[PDB]
C-alpha cells in the first residue's frame with residue numbers, strides 16, 4: 802500500500818524566534834510509515850512531514866493539521882495512536898486536513914486584513930510577502946524555485962502571527978518565483 806505521512810521535524814512559531822528542529826531521520830521512518838504508529842509526541846504549530854522520498858510542511862490551524870494534497874495524497878498520518886485517516890480532502894483546492902495532533906499548538910485564523918504577510922519556509926526562514934489577491938502574494942525578493950521547494954503546506958502569517966493561509970504553489974517564470982499562491986484561511990474555514 803501507500804505508507805503513512807511521517808512527521809520528521811517541526812518549526813516553532815511561538816515566542817520571539819522561528820526555528821526548525823529535526824526529530825526523525827530516514828532510518829526510523831520506514832517503520833513509522835508502514836505501521837502508521839509514531840511514538841513521538843507532537844510539538845509546535847508547523848510539522849515537517851515526509852513521504853518516501855519527499856518532504857513538505859503541515860500547519861495546524863483551528864485544531865486541524867493542514868497540508869497540501871500534492872504532498873500527502875490520500876495518506877493517513879502516523880501518530881502515537883496509530884494511523885490517522887484524513888479528516889478533510891479536497892483535490893481541487895490541493896488541500897488535506899487531519900485532526901490536530903496532541904499536543905500541537907494551533908494557529909489562529911487571521912482577521913486583521915493586513916497586506917503584510919510572512920511566509921515560513923521549511924528552514925524556518927520568515928520571508929516577507931505583499932498580499933495581492935485572495936490567494937496570492939508577491940515576494941519582495943524573487944527566489945529560485947529550489948529555495949521554496951518542500952515548503953508547501955507551510956503558513957503565510959500576518960504581522961501578529963495569525964494564519965492567513967497555506968502555501969500551495971509558486972507563481973513562477975523560468976524557474977524563478979516572483980510570488981506565492983496559497984490557500985486562504987477562509988477557504989479552510991469553508992472546507993470545515
Ligand SMILES: C=C[C@@H]1C[C@]1(NC(=O)[C@@H]1C[C@@H](Oc2ncc(OC)c3ccc(Cl)cc23)CN1C(=O)[C@@H](NC(=O)OC(C)(C)C)C(C)(C)C)C(=O)NS(=O)(=O)C1CC1
Nearest residue numbers: 857870871872892894895949950951952953969970971972
Ligand atoms: C516550488 C514551490 C512549490 C510550493 C510547492 N508547490 C508546488 O510545486 C505545486 C504543485 C502543483 O500545484 C498543484 N498541484 C496539485 C493541485 O491539486 C491537487 C493543485 C491545485 C491547485 C493549485 Cl493552485 C496548484 C496545485 C504545481 N506547483 C507549483 O508550485 C507550480 N506553480 C503553479 O502551478 O503556479 C500556479 C498555480 C500559479 C499556476 C510550479 C511547479 C510551476 C512551481 C512545493 O514546494 N511543493 S513540494 O516540493 O513541497 C511537494 C509536496 C512535495
Ligand SMILES: [Zn+2]
Nearest residue numbers: 911913959963
Ligand atoms: Zn492577523
